[PDB]
Amino acid sequence: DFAKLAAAQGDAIDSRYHPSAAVRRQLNKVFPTHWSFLLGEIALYSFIILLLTGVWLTLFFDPSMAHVTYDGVYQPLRGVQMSRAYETALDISFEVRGGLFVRQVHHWAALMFAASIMVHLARIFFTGAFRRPREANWVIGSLLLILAMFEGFFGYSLPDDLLSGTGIRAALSGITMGIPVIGTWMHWALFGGDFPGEILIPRLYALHILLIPGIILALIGAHLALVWFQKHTQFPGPGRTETNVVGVRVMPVFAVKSGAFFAMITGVLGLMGGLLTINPIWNLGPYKPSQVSAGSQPDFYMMWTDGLIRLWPAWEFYPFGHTIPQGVWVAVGMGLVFALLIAYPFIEKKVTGDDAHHNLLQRPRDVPVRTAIGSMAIALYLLLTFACMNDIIALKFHISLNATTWIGRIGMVVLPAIVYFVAYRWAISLQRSDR
Amino acid sequence: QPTDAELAEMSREELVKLGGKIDGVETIFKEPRWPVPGTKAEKRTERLVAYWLMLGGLSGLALLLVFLFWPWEYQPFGSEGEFLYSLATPLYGLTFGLSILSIGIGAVLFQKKFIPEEISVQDRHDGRSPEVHRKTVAANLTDALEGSTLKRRKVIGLSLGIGLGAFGAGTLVAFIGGLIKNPWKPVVPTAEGKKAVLWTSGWTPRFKGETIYLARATGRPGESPFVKMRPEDIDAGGMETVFPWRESDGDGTTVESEHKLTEIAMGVRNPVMLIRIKPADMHRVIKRKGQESFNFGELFAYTKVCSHLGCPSSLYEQQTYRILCPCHQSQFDALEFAKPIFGPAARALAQLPITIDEDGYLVANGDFVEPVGPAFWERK
């Protein structure tokens, strides 16, 4: 009898660990069943896929920068001098069965991971889930976004292809080597010398596969533990009060629903990783400091910085026989953006003056000031994302070769203002639509 | 609260309520999906869920079959097996993702069509503790601090802080003391002593009178022998890429020469763009204060590395005499000493003085009069 075996095993577990009281509390936990509450599940589930696929890739990847001659099955690159990082990346795609499928699933999982964080951040921002007592979880999450920001960038540069290597030279090396007073000290420190060096890829490989995921995993564990014990918020409705949770229990509804949603995320990721080609590194060849390609395909989880580089005017300072290049503005710009994002609830509670306990989610239309600001921030992010595909955009109207950036320069203040006004007016209209 | 006698006669329905009451969960509504067993709709829905789950196994078995028995090896463009190879990875993802996606679909259908619908309310005890745990935990921590008498012993307290601080400062410095390198430590042997890496490049002379050739690349730079050129090798409006090559560098035949040639191509400030403007355009040419006599005839040599972020600007418009950087789209007016005219670039490209030797080969007349590449704090 299976019931006899189940009773015997349950008896053995209870006699040794006595978890019946603890398990029953865990099984009776009630979770709200809103559609927007699955936004954080996709990001968490994508991270697991990244962990599983990243482990597989580590069994065939050599992070060395040592110059070697290609001897694989790719005829166009036969005899071409490259690094061990590029050859093993080629080895995974061609001389390993299923390596290309795993490599593309891993890259697609990263895109879904980064996209889900921003979408899930919008839900927290718009619905006011960052208020007390969930202000510390916003800070923990904000660190996760920053860590996942650099984690994807480091991994994308691991194959050391022509496109990825160019980004390291301009972004990682060019911007860092121009930071006031310590910029060259930070460059000789991370690169261990001058670009390219010989410890770049090995240092990033250790950071990308081990150190950053370890911090992310620890922060995710603290993030999930906080939500589990802080009893996730709910939208106002029939029977919804500030001192109760309305939804379904863990068993057997939420456990099955969450488990089946995990399968769909894995199923969707497997479909895109096999059918849609992402980041073909063999078409570009190994990175060479003397060669840079024109037609590229940068990731959307780290492009807004590139768009800010192009749009910002060439403003430089030369104080007393020194130089402050244009790249300092972009590096400083990321500091304010990250600082403002992390400490939003503290600023929000300082201007609104409310520091009370909140468990019921606030309606986006209720606060048109925040809604419009979030829409303005989302709009500003999108133009900065779309400001670096100017090469294709320029050959669409043909009114001028350089007027494309002037559209960005002028249109990075007018369009966000327009989006702010439209969202603010829409919130008030929706407020009184049913009132 | 109930004794063992009551628990014996309690049924499962009341036991679930009793367990939820302790945890604060109140299941206010529980209803089965099918009120009348035996209807055809329930049987039809059961078959639909089975079809989704069976399709997962059929696709999962296909994944095992296509992984084993299918041409997976890479085939070159224009070959008999190229078409079958191009379908290898798509079939790997089609038979894998669709296998588990259908399983997840069949489980969602099961939970919202066969698992009874429920809505449970759980009382959340948020806020401060009920004033009994707060007082006890505060006393427990205060008793440990007061009982240890650490507050009234300043000699131990100050020593502990200084001792822990000194150990922490030493350990932290020693932990990151091996990742701190002076960027201006003279390491590059030049004509005048040893200079820092940023102040030098492949065009920096190593001794007085050293001859450096504007050598072309036969094939890929660093993998093919470098060949010298003469002025009668670039047509009007043409563009050529040159590297700093010495006669003692060899042609890559030997192992030592191959390493030397690789370092030339590995140089981040080594590439230089050589351009020849048409004779009908020398009138509209503006020189730079210090580089008036750097050009040789109608031949100009500007560094290929962009002054903004270090991208080697490969694009060059012969019609407009403009140099375009492919990274951030910066144009440099080659007529006006390669000064920037649009984009985030703010500094003109460095100009390399050039001339000819006794044999007529193009050579570098000297070193750059300014640092090459992106700017930094200690520049100029």
Binding site: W315, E316, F317, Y318 | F207, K208, G209, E210, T211, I286, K287, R288, K289, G290, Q291, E292, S293, F294, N295, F296, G297, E336, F337, K339, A346, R347, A348, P353, I354, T355, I356, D357, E358, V363, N365, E370, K380
Partner: peptide, 25 residues
């Protein structure tokens, strides 16, 4: 700001002399 060490010149340029080459080793 404008780079102080970057200004145009109006003085005509002279043809560079031929390179001779002094060998140190």
């Amino acid at each position: 700001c404008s780079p102080p060490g970057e200004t145009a010149s109006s003085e005509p340029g002279t043809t560079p002399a031929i390179w001779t080459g002094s060998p140190s080793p």
